[PDB]
Design a binder for this molecule. Sequence first.
Ligand SMILES: CC(=O)SCCNC(=O)CCNC(=O)[C@H](O)C(C)(C)COP(=O)(O)OP(=O)(O)OC[C@H]1O[C@@H](n2cnc3c(N)ncnc32)[C@H](O)[C@@H]1OP(=O)(O)O
Ligand SMILES: [Cl-]
Ligand SMILES: [Cl-]
Ligand SMILES: [Cl-]
Length: 196
Amino acid sequence: SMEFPFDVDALFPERITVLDQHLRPPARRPGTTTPARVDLQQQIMTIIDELGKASAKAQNLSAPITSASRMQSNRHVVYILKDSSARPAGAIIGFIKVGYKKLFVLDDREAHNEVEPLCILDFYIHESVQRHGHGRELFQYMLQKERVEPHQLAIDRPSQKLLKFLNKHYNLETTVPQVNNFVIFEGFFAHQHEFG
Ligand SMILES: CC(=O)SCCNC(=O)CCNC(=O)[C@H](O)C(C)(C)COP(=O)(O)OP(=O)(O)OC[C@H]1O[C@@H](n2cnc3c(N)ncnc32)[C@H](O)[C@@H]1OP(=O)(O)O
Ligand SMILES: [Cl-]
Ligand SMILES: [Cl-]
Ligand SMILES: [Cl-]
């Protein structure tokens, strides 16, 4: 999939790496690798920049919606999928980016609600390996770490591929019409209904 000069496996030991505005390299014990020629955080910044550009090309966007500089100035969390057993040994498969956002969301009565749901903001799997289950790997990992259910999410400008994905995997089919270009599904307001 996506190839980089520096040692990705040394940088990201785990299959899925979780980063936020700090862009902090995963933990490592002193001595377990020689200090790289490129600082670890610079490697991370380059990876985020390139992933965001690739996602923008996939989505036919004139500018990336994910980048190192945007990560540093926002409250977003990115989950990055890498294959530790890739061949030939070196690569990054893709990522999902989420964040809580304050939104004014319409309910099924067309009334406005001030809410702060977890939002799906950017999501990309390299073209060569789309439709192989990697998107679901990332999505599931994120749901588990964030402790949220699919119907509780808002989606920023979902693509056709993502709408199909959400219906297939999570039975998210029926939307509640919005004016803010986010999409929500039936069940979005269930928690508000129960708890207030
Ligand atoms: C808020 C946002 O991020 S909107 C932008 C979402 N990102 C994009 O559209 C970028 C291009 N697409 C991708 O990167 C990926 O296809 C993702 C992230 C949408 C999904 O990840 P994938 O690894 O492809 O999904 P995964 O293999 O886990 O699940 C497959 C399902 O996704 C949907 N899907 C994936 N590719 C396609 C496709 N080319 N056409 C129609 N549906 C598709 C289908 O529901 C499919 O199931 P099916 O094969 O039985 O029809
Ligand atoms: Cl694509
Ligand atoms: Cl970002
Ligand atoms: Cl609802």
